[PDB]
């Protein structure tokens, strides 16, 4: 039984997750935010180190012990609800190293292919590397980005401690660590359709991608 799968990869703050979850909910998909399992792992680690030292042998044997879960996009870890903290900015400042160490993305890649395994319908995964490791099948490979200044507007916005200028380097940075690194970078393949949506509404890119969906699946059906 064929089940639908769409991987959605962008920089930071380019709206993919709500843009996401309002393309999952139009078409009956489930929808992963695989970046929460990277800031559980990070929170994690804050709240026992203190310091974040992902090759440490203590850190490493702590991550590798760690059971983490996943439902509705809720991260258990060793059974406790952390999802409350995954947008803590002490987890924003320590993400970035530990999604660059290797066995820490080996851990978080059975995570997500168990809960895509599960998925009997479809599923909308959103992330860095959704298309080019988790899902490299996906029926539909999405590039969702804007300028860096749109996207640091559109976090500014929301609210918070930062500056304008603060946010825009901060995501220039992460931006940066994440098509530079050298395990699983962030980067568009020549099988992506890239969505810069700096003139769209949010539910203008989600139907975006319903439509680009549509297309692929009357295609592939058929071919
Ligand atoms: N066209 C759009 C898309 C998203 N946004 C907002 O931009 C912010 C970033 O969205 P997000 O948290 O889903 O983005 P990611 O960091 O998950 O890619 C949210 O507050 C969205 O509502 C917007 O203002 N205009
Ligand atoms: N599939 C993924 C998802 C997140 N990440 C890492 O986790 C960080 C936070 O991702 P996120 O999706 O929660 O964050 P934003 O896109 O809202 O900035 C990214 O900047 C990457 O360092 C990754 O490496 N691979």
Not at 84 to 110: G, M, P, W
Not at 193 to 207: F, G, H, P, R, Y
Not at 216 to 222: D, I, L
Request: proline fraction near 2%; include cysteine; aromatic fraction near 6%.
């Amino acid at each position: 039984m064929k089940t639908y799968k769409i991987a959605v990869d962008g920089p930071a703050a380019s709206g993919k997750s709500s843009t996401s979850d309002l393309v999952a909910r139009k078409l009956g998909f489930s929808h992963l935010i695989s970046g929460n399992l990277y800031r559980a792992v990070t929170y994690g680690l804050v709240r026992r180190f203190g310091e974040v030292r992902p090759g440490d042998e203590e850190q490493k044997r702590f991550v590798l012990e760690l059971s983490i879960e996943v439902r509705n996009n809720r991260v258990f870890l060793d059974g406790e609800d952390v999802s409350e903290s995954l947008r803590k900015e002490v987890v924003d400042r320590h993400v970035v190293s530990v999604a660059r160490e290797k066995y820490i993305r080996e851990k978080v890649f059975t995570i997500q292919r168990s809960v895509i395994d599960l998925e009997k319908r479809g599923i909308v995964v959103d992330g860095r590397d959704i298309a080019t490791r988790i899902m490299p099948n996906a029926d539909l490979k999405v590039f969702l980005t804007a300028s860096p200044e749109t996207r640091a507007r559109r976090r500014y916005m929301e609210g918070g401690s930062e500056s304008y200028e603060e946010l825009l380097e901060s995501i220039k940075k992460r931006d940066h660590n994440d098509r530079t690194r050298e395990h699983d970078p962030l980067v568009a393949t020549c099988d992506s359709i890239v969505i810069e949506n700096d003139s769209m509404t949010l539910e203008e890119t989600a139907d975006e991608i319903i439509r680009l969906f549509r297309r692929v699946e009357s295609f592939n059906a058929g071919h």
